[PDB]
PDB file of C-alpha atoms in Angstrom:
ATOM      1  CA  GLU A   1     -87.947 157.713 139.912  1.00  0.00           C
ATOM      2  CA  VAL A   2     -89.238 160.068 138.293  1.00  0.00           C
ATOM      3  CA  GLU A   3     -86.194 161.614 136.758  1.00  0.00           C
ATOM      4  CA  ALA A   4     -85.495 158.068 136.002  1.00  0.00           C
ATOM      5  CA  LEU A   5     -88.883 157.974 133.804  1.00  0.00           C
ATOM      6  CA  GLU A   6     -87.836 161.519 132.727  1.00  0.00           C
ATOM      7  CA  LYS A   7     -84.822 159.660 131.057  1.00  0.00           C
ATOM      8  CA  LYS A   8     -87.051 156.760 129.781  1.00  0.00           C
ATOM      9  CA  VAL A   9     -89.503 159.253 128.086  1.00  0.00           C
ATOM     10  CA  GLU A  10     -86.738 161.073 126.374  1.00  0.00           C
ATOM     11  CA  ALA A  11     -85.415 157.657 124.838  1.00  0.00           C
ATOM     12  CA  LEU A  12     -88.679 156.750 123.799  1.00  0.00           C
ATOM     13  CA  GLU A  13     -89.438 160.334 121.949  1.00  0.00           C
ATOM     14  CA  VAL A  14     -86.529 159.811 120.313  1.00  0.00           C
ATOM     15  CA  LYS A  15     -87.103 156.358 119.399  1.00  0.00           C
ATOM     16  CA  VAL A  16     -90.538 157.590 117.954  1.00  0.00           C
ATOM     17  CA  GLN A  17     -88.986 160.494 116.017  1.00  0.00           C
ATOM     18  CA  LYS A  18     -86.876 157.659 114.133  1.00  0.00           C
ATOM     19  CA  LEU A  19     -89.702 155.614 113.228  1.00  0.00           C
ATOM     20  CA  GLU A  20     -91.926 159.004 111.902  1.00  0.00           C
ATOM     21  CA  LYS A  21     -88.748 159.254 110.067  1.00  0.00           C
ATOM     22  CA  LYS A  22     -88.956 155.362 108.456  1.00  0.00           C
ATOM     23  CA  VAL A  23     -92.067 155.020 107.998  1.00  0.00           C
ATOM     24  CA  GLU A  24     -92.506 158.618 106.225  1.00  0.00           C
ATOM     25  CA  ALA A  25     -89.460 157.298 103.705  1.00  0.00           C
ATOM     26  CA  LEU A  26     -91.357 154.365 103.317  1.00  0.00           C
ATOM     27  CA  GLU A  27     -94.728 155.686 102.405  1.00  0.00           C
ATOM     28  CA  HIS A  28     -93.886 158.355 100.420  1.00  0.00           C
ATOM     29  CA  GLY A  29     -91.086 155.985  98.825  1.00  0.00           C
ATOM     30  CA  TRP A  30     -88.002 158.456  99.749  1.00  0.00           C
ATOM     31  CA  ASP A  31     -84.208 157.956  97.356  1.00  0.00           C
ATOM     32  CA  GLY A  32     -85.692 154.790  96.980  1.00  0.00           C
ATOM     33  CA  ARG A  33     -86.668 153.163 100.334  1.00  0.00           C
TER      34      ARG A  33
ATOM     35  CA  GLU B   1     -99.615 158.256 139.249  1.00  0.00           C
ATOM     36  CA  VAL B   2     -96.245 157.441 139.133  1.00  0.00           C
ATOM     37  CA  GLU B   3     -96.364 153.414 139.661  1.00  0.00           C
ATOM     38  CA  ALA B   4     -99.712 154.213 136.422  1.00  0.00           C
ATOM     39  CA  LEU B   5     -96.642 155.919 134.441  1.00  0.00           C
ATOM     40  CA  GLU B   6     -94.070 153.656 134.746  1.00  0.00           C
ATOM     41  CA  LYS B   7     -96.651 150.929 134.324  1.00  0.00           C
ATOM     42  CA  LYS B   8     -98.142 153.187 130.226  1.00  0.00           C
ATOM     43  CA  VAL B   9     -94.514 154.110 129.836  1.00  0.00           C
ATOM     44  CA  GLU B  10     -93.293 149.979 129.834  1.00  0.00           C
ATOM     45  CA  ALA B  11     -96.143 149.577 128.118  1.00  0.00           C
ATOM     46  CA  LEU B  12     -95.527 151.927 125.619  1.00  0.00           C
ATOM     47  CA  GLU B  13     -91.590 150.654 125.238  1.00  0.00           C
ATOM     48  CA  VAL B  14     -93.247 147.026 123.787  1.00  0.00           C
ATOM     49  CA  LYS B  15     -95.363 148.716 121.673  1.00  0.00           C
ATOM     50  CA  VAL B  16     -91.980 150.599 120.509  1.00  0.00           C
ATOM     51  CA  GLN B  17     -89.582 147.580 119.936  1.00  0.00           C
ATOM     52  CA  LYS B  18     -93.338 146.214 117.726  1.00  0.00           C
ATOM     53  CA  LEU B  19     -92.906 148.737 115.682  1.00  0.00           C
ATOM     54  CA  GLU B  20     -89.008 148.870 115.056  1.00  0.00           C
ATOM     55  CA  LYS B  21     -89.056 145.351 114.131  1.00  0.00           C
ATOM     56  CA  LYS B  22     -91.975 145.568 111.750  1.00  0.00           C
ATOM     57  CA  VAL B  23     -90.499 148.678 110.937  1.00  0.00           C
ATOM     58  CA  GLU B  24     -86.718 146.859 110.029  1.00  0.00           C
ATOM     59  CA  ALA B  25     -88.802 143.996 108.365  1.00  0.00           C
ATOM     60  CA  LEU B  26     -90.683 146.326 105.677  1.00  0.00           C
ATOM     61  CA  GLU B  27     -87.423 148.756 105.011  1.00  0.00           C
ATOM     62  CA  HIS B  28     -84.579 145.473 104.528  1.00  0.00           C
ATOM     63  CA  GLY B  29     -86.997 142.690 101.923  1.00  0.00           C
ATOM     64  CA  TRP B  30     -86.960 139.573 105.258  1.00  0.00           C
ATOM     65  CA  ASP B  31     -89.141 136.672 104.555  1.00  0.00           C
ATOM     66  CA  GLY B  32     -90.543 139.037 101.669  1.00  0.00           C
ATOM     67  CA  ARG B  33     -92.233 141.160 103.624  1.00  0.00           C
TER      68      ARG B  33
ATOM     69  CA  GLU C   1     -92.650 167.170 137.081  1.00  0.00           C
ATOM     70  CA  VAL C   2     -95.150 164.788 137.432  1.00  0.00           C
ATOM     71  CA  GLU C   3     -98.255 166.562 135.335  1.00  0.00           C
ATOM     72  CA  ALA C   4     -95.512 167.370 132.647  1.00  0.00           C
ATOM     73  CA  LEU C   5     -94.575 163.673 132.354  1.00  0.00           C
ATOM     74  CA  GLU C   6     -98.429 162.832 131.557  1.00  0.00           C
ATOM     75  CA  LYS C   7     -99.053 164.870 129.167  1.00  0.00           C
ATOM     76  CA  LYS C   8     -95.648 163.724 126.640  1.00  0.00           C
ATOM     77  CA  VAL C   9     -96.381 160.268 127.168  1.00  0.00           C
ATOM     78  CA  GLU C  10    -100.639 160.497 126.661  1.00  0.00           C
ATOM     79  CA  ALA C  11     -98.738 162.582 123.115  1.00  0.00           C
ATOM     80  CA  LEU C  12     -96.365 159.430 123.190  1.00  0.00           C
ATOM     81  CA  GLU C  13     -99.333 157.145 123.230  1.00  0.00           C
ATOM     82  CA  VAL C  14    -100.809 159.305 120.233  1.00  0.00           C
ATOM     83  CA  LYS C  15     -97.869 159.105 118.437  1.00  0.00           C
ATOM     84  CA  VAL C  16     -96.938 155.489 118.694  1.00  0.00           C
ATOM     85  CA  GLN C  17    -101.072 154.353 117.784  1.00  0.00           C
ATOM     86  CA  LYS C  18    -100.275 156.653 114.052  1.00  0.00           C
ATOM     87  CA  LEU C  19     -97.460 154.579 113.568  1.00  0.00           C
ATOM     88  CA  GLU C  20     -98.769 151.675 114.255  1.00  0.00           C
ATOM     89  CA  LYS C  21    -101.509 152.520 111.925  1.00  0.00           C
ATOM     90  CA  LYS C  22     -99.223 153.420 109.208  1.00  0.00           C
ATOM     91  CA  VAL C  23     -97.059 150.033 110.067  1.00  0.00           C
ATOM     92  CA  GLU C  24    -100.292 148.259 109.525  1.00  0.00           C
ATOM     93  CA  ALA C  25    -101.238 150.078 106.707  1.00  0.00           C
ATOM     94  CA  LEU C  26     -97.920 149.801 104.829  1.00  0.00           C
ATOM     95  CA  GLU C  27     -97.965 145.857 105.911  1.00  0.00           C
ATOM     96  CA  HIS C  28    -101.602 144.585 104.972  1.00  0.00           C
ATOM     97  CA  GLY C  29    -101.385 147.192 101.278  1.00  0.00           C
ATOM     98  CA  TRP C  30    -104.862 148.464 102.114  1.00  0.00           C
ATOM     99  CA  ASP C  31    -105.926 150.937  99.755  1.00  0.00           C
ATOM    100  CA  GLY C  32    -102.760 150.321  97.316  1.00  0.00           C
ATOM    101  CA  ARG C  33    -100.345 151.678 100.492  1.00  0.00           C
TER     102      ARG C  33
END
């Protein structure tokens, strides 16, 4: 259980990082995004 | 503890999925969003 | 392990909340965002 939860949490961290990059690009208009 | 953490993680997964949909809609201009 | 995972999950919750605010601001055009 705990090992599997470590994996889910790591995957969520990756998903959140990608969302943060995409949102910062929208907010700042980077490269015309 | 572990059971309660499973619930928090599942709820986060749902929140992240909704964020991903909203961000993809903004990035692509779907339906004028 | 479990204690450390509680911390990671709490930090993710905070990150997700901030993303939700930023995305709602983009979607609604609040304050010209």
